């Protein structure tokens, strides 16, 4: 018990590993990877076709009972062929446990809407569509939720610029708010912070 180091909990690591292979055994059609992190978080990585079967099994199965959808988000990784990682964070009140389910898609491929599994997903999927452009099929009412009406682009994409492409002001001539190409009085200053020396050997990637 060193004061500055986070303690490691191995009973949970074993419990999550056991349930991880339990899920993989039951749903081999869709499960591609199962892993447990060093802070004890189980992640299931699945084929996108299995969004509804996997989530439904986790919600309803007596040994799962993940009744609460904590969060549904996406991550943009431009280097990947399927750049968008879709992340479901589920909570089980019965077993006081959490699980993360991950799938993927690209710009032109839709994902089945999980609203039929969790009604919480309605606005989460609207946010993912609005900020990343990932279309969800058979969504009850898909449309922008966070951006301005008529806004073009998906800001949370890595290739979308931080300050966007347009900006607003009030023009007295036309007596309304107008949109114009963005010019900044002070450009945002890019900082190169990365140290040129490796920090974490344990995560080194083979050459």
């Amino acid at each position: 018990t060193r004061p500055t180091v986070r303690p490691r909990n191995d009973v949970a690591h074993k419990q999550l590993s056991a349930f991880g292979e339990y899920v993989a055994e039951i749903l081999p059609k869709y499960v591609q990877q199962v892993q447990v992190s060093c802070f004890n978080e189980l992640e299931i990585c699945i084929h996108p076709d299995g969004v509804i079967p996997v989530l439904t099994f986790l919600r309803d199965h007596s040994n799962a009972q993940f009744k609460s959808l904590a969060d549904l988000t996406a991550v943009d990784i431009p280097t990947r062929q399927n750049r968008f990682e879709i992340v479901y964070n589920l909570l089980s009140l019965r077993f006081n446990s959490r699980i993360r389910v991950k799938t993927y898609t690209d710009e032109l491929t839709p994902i089945e809407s999980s609203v039929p599994v969790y009604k919480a997903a309605n606005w989460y999927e609207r946010e993912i569509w609005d900020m990343f452009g990932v279309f969800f099929a058979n969504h009850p009412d898909l449309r922008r939720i966070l951006t301005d009406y008529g806004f073009e682009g998906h800001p949370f994409r890595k290739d979308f610029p931080l300050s966007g492409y347009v900006e607003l002001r009030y023009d007295d001539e036309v007596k309304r708010v107008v949109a114009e190409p963005v010019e900044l009085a002070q450009e945002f200053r890019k900082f190169d912070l990365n140290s040129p020396w490796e920090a974490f050997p344990a995560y080194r990637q083979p050459p």
Partner: protein
């Protein structure tokens, strides 16, 4: 604190409490605004020996995730079922 006895009585009766014992205006029961200097303690790693950083480096004990299954016997649940909460003995019914 300057209220007269009659007014103290009146607002006590109207409220139904003894308002004077727990006034909401602060007087001289608060800490002084000039305090003596502190002398704060140091942490466990303030040693001159037996203190090599490589024995107390949390970031370097972090490891990548354990791959349980990669596509490259009894049933289990994620954890034991949660115990049912017990009612409070302090005040079970508000």
């Amino acid at each position: 604190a300057s209220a007269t006895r009659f007014i103290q009585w009146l607002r006590n009766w109207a409220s139904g409490r003894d308002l004077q014992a727990k006034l909401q205006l602060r007087y001289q029961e608060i800490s002084k605004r000039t305090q003596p200097p502190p002398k704060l303690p140091v942490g466990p790693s303030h040693k001159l020996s037996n203190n090599y950083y490589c024995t107390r480096d949390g970031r370097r004990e972090a490891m990548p995730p354990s791959i349980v299954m990669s596509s490259q016997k009894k049933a289990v649940s994620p954890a034991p079922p949660i115990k049912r909460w017990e009612l409070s003995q302090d005040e079970p019914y508000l």
